[PDB]
Amino acid sequence: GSGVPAFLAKLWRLVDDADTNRLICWTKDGQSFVIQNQAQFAKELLPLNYKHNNMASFIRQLNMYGFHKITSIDNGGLRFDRDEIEFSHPFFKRNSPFLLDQIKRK
C-alpha cells in the first residue's frame, strides 16, 4: 500500500484465496509461487483481474518487473509436475513488508 500498484497487490491475494488453490500457490514454504496449470490459469483468473486473457502477455510482463523462472531453457521440459513454471523473486516473499514497494517496470 502507499505505493504498491494494483498489480503486485493482486499477486498477493490471487496466490492466496481458495478458488485459486490449484492454478497458483506458494512454493513449498513461501519463497515465491508457481502455476502448474498454465491453461485455465489464463481464461479463469486474468479476466476477473487484468481483463485481458493473453497468457504469454502476463509472463512477458514478468520479464519487465524482474523475474527469473528456473525452468524451460535449452533443456528437457516435457509434461512433468515437478518443475512446474516456478517463478523465483527474492522481492515477493511473505514477511519483509517492504519488498512490494520496490519491484517496478525497470
UniProtKB/Swiss-Prot annotation:
Localization in the cell: Nucleus
DNA-binding region (UniProt annotation): 4-106
Highest taxon listed in the record's lineage: Eukaryota
Record note on modification: Exhibits temperature-dependent phosphorylation.
Function summary: DNA-binding protein that specifically binds heat shock promoter elements (HSE) and activates transcription. In higher eukaryotes, HSF is unable to bind to the HSE unless the cells are heat shocked.
Quaternary structure (record): Homotrimer.
Family: Belongs to the HSF family.
Name by which UniProt lists this protein: Heat shock factor protein
Gene from which this protein is expressed: Hsf
First and last residues shown, out of full length: 43 to 148 of 691
